Design a protein around this ligand. Structure first.
Ligand code: MG
Ligand code: MG
Lengths: 51, 101, 42, 126, 50, 50, 126
């Protein structure tokens, strides 16, 4: 058998320095969508891609 | 990264110098803890049906690797739903009473 | 035959760790190849 | 093109700085500059200056000996002093220590250029 | 949800999150497997944790 | 004749001259995808009824 | 028909240029040229001119030397410069680098043809 998956060793262990990095990336992902979306047409769609 | 928020603050409450077998925690691979693990997932599968444990909770049980965290999730999700059913019984009781009013 | 698959299982137990450690080493090689201006990774 | 990049093994690995050259000065350029972006929308850089992290190091200015002793800069020019603080990080762009070493060294030339600009601004109006 | 937890429970989660990670990271079941071959050959099975 | 309409127009878009494996498409006969094929084919029957 | 086409291995592969030969001049054809299509809806092209991305390079015009020194042309007319800037990509029409090279090379001789026309129309009215 051959399944070699990258897995989280402790998946229920979320800390502060993991959480402050995820909020930083979603701030970057929010920053991108204000530039790419022609306003009011696909801005709701990309939000449904990142809700 | 490998520990949680509450798990990293244990280092502050004192005495962590002392071995874990002094505080009641032992490393055990024996037939007692595999029987307790096989009971605690069979109990969760019997609690997945009859709508007692959500599908959010059971996937946390499969990715827990400790018999006391997965014990507390069965306890936590039963207290939440039995609180919700007791208030749903209460709001349905007063609704017919205000209809009676 | 299962008890004859135990006599040669030490050779697969080291080998399934070289498969683990090479894929960890292949993973960090790709992470540097991310920051190397490659449009395949998108 | 070698300017702030390490093109090895089929990749394009940079350390962050942008060696802005091959255009010419502001007076010898028909478009008055290289015009790297639109923000001020005419962001114009010339042939000698170096830009790191949306900050420009000017080639026309010079390094005062007061500002060479403190902050310990190496070149005669603020642009030429940033081309010597990136000489380690140009050969090892993906290191954890070089990117912390660059950003700590690019900040010293950042505050030194901002301090030397205010001194000539004060001496001009005086 | 950590009000229903206990002190012996939070110490037990931290102990397993240490042990579940490093068993999977170093592949510790192979380190114990080479140690069994010295057990049948010397009568000794020694490990250092540093 | 052998291609669809949207398959015909992929030639019109930039850089088709680059191996499909750059773009995320590989040819694969492995047990991972035969498992995927009956998982999608019995999901079709489970959606055919109901 | 060999004009900008590579008829090899049973297929007709082209790079995108359209060598329009064999017809004659606009006054020599009875239909006023070798019409290309309906869009001005009578789009007429003659024996010397070539087409890339619906922009036609006129063979009747001449290359000024100042329009030759910048933009680095090679032919003696505008069509003969576009019949020489495509010599690579006519034999390798599927290459990613040639069709990037032909795309940039045709944008030069297009804009060099416009600046020759705006110099020609400004001279005649004054
Ligand atoms: Mg974690
Ligand atoms: Mg068909």
């Amino acid at each position: 058998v051959f399944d070699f998956k990258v897995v989280v060793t402790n998946p229920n262990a979320i800390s502060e320095i993991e959480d402050n990095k995820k909020n930083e990336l979603l701030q970057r992902l929010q920053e991108m969508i204000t530039d790419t979306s022609i306003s009011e047409d696909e801005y709701n769609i990309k939000l449904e891609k990142l809700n | 990264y490998i520990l949680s928020d509450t798990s990293t603050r244990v280092m502050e409450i004192d005495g962590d110098e002392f071995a874990e077998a002094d505080y009641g925690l032992v490393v055990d691979n024996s037939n007692g803890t595999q029987e307790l693990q096989q009971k605690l997932d069979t109990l969760a599968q019997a609690a997945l049906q009859t709508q007692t444990l959500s599908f959010s909770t059971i996937t946390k049980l499969y990715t827990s690797s400790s018999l006391a965290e997965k014990q507390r999730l069965i306890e936590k999700d039963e207290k939440q739903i039995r609180e919700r059913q007791a208030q749903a019984q209460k709001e349905q009781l007063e609704a017919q009473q205000q209809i009676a009013a | 035959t299962l008890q004859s698959s135990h006599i040669t299982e030490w050779l697969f137990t080291i080998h399934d760790d070289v498969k683990k450690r090479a894929l960890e080493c292949f993973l960090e090689t790709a992470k540097v190849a991310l920051k190397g201006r490659n449009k395949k990774f998108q | 093109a070698f300017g702030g990049w390490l093109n090895t093994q089929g990749g394009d690995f940079t350390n962050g700085v942008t060696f802005i050259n091959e255009g010419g000065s502001h007076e010898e350029n028909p478009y008055q500059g290289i015009q790297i972006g639109v923000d001020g929308a005419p962001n114009l850089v010339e042939q000698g200056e170096v830009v790191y992290d949306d900050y420009v190091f000017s080639d026309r200015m010079e390094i005062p000996d007061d500002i060479r002793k403190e902050y310990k800069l190496r070149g005669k020019t603020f642009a030429k002093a940033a081309k010597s603080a990136q000489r380690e990080s140009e050969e090892r762009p993906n290191d954890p220590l070089s990117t912390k070493g660059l950003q700590a060294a690019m900040e010293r030339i950042a505050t030194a250029q901002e301090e030397a600009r205010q001194r000539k601004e004060a001496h001009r109006e005086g | 949800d950590y009000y229903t937890y206990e002190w012996q429970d939070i110490r037990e989660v931290r102990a397993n999150e240490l042990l579940n990670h490093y068993i999977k990271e170093y592949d510790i079941p192979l380190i114990f497997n080479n140690g069994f071959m010295d057990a049948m050959t010397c009568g000794e099975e020694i490990y250092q944790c540093d």
